[PDB]
Amino acid sequence: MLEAKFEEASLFKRIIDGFKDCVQLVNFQCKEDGIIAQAVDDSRVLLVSLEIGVEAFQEYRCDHPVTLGMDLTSLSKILRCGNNTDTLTLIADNTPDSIILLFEDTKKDRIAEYSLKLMDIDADFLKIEELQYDSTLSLPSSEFSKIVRDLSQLSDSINIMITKETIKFVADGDIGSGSVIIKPFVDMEHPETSIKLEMDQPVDLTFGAKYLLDIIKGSSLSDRVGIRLSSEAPALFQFDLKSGFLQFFLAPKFNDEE
């Protein structure tokens, strides 16, 4: 059965904010070691993958895995009742037709409970993550958001190029061209602002700006973002959670491929 209680409804609301808009259907699965969820957009260029370990919850009980699919829009519609500080408990039996969201305030006072209708989705979780990527980098997610928000205005394609000690984002369209160049650096005054880069091979990939814009939402879940790029597979943008992570895998444009 499903029985997962979040200390603050806010964490779940921000997680769902990440799937929001860019995907319509999400397939959740709770099990002994936590909850995972996957959602793929219609064009199949973006995969949103979540993992929340048992320790991220205030209470978690699972003696029998349950897989459940649902409409993302329906879920978010209901995901603004958490008061953020409310407690949230996800509940479902072993053969559910619905998922119960139970928000409660500390005192017995107010109890908002929802029963969301589920969709049947053929269980088919993807495992496309690579052992090694050509290059790996992390930087503050607010910085990544700004970089994406800058360039987005110029083109529907933003290129990421990596060479030794150099990361360069570029957009070029009608009104002109733009670029943001960042360099690796360790800030001891607070290392959450550092910019790390490990390059095994220079990379140069292009992504559809509309998708990078969907991805930047993860800033609200983590201070830093990890970006792993390869010429052999979809790029991985990752936002770590306390016991967990939200991952976005994005297929590079072939020449025209988001």
- Shortest CB 103 distance to a copy of itself, Å: 9
Using the rule CB under 5 A, which residue among 16, 25, 54, 62 binds Hg ion? 62
* Strand (E) or helix (H) holding 205: strand 203-208
> How many CA within 13 A on the CB side of residue 80?
5
Pick between residue 67 and residue 98 the one whose CB is nearest to a copy of itself.
98
Pick between residue 96 and residue 184 the one whose CB is nearest to Hg ion.
96
Name which of residues 115 to 134 contact a copy of itself (CB under 8 A).
115-117
* Strand (E) or helix (H) holding 15: helix 9-19
Q: Which stretch binds a copy of itself (CB under 8 A): 16-24, 57-65, 168-176, 200-208?
A: 168-176
**Choosing among a copy of itself, Hg ion, none, which partner's interface includes residue 62 (Cβ < 5 to 8 Å by kind)?**
Hg ion
| First CA to last CA distance, the chain | 38
The β-bridge relationship of strands 34-40 and 46-53 is antiparallel
Other Cβ atoms closer than 10 A to 15: 25
Q: Which two tokens stand for residue 87?
A: 């407690």
> How many CA within 13 A on the CB side of residue 10?
6
Using the rule CB under 8 A, which residue among 153, 201, 231, 243 binds a copy of itself? 153
User: Given the structure tokens 């690579």, which residue do they identify?
Assistant: 130
Pick between residue 129 and residue 172 the one whose CB is nearest to a copy of itself.
172
Using the rule CB under 8 A, which residue among 44, 95, 106, 109 binds a copy of itself? 109
* Strand (E) or helix (H) holding 49: strand 46-53
**Choosing among a copy of itself, Hg ion, none, which partner's interface includes residue 61 (Cβ < 5 to 8 Å by kind)?**
none
User: Given the structure tokens 């529907």, which residue do they identify?
Assistant: 156
Name which of residues 11 to 70 contact a copy of itself (CB under 8 A).
none
Other Cβ atoms closer than 10 A to 122: 6
Positions in the binding site for a copy of itself (CB under 8 A)? 71, 74, 77-78, 80-81, 83, 98, 107-117, 143, 146-147, 149-150, 153-154, 174-183, 185, 195
Positions in the binding site for Hg ion (CB under 5 A)? 21-22, 30, 62, 65-66, 214, 217
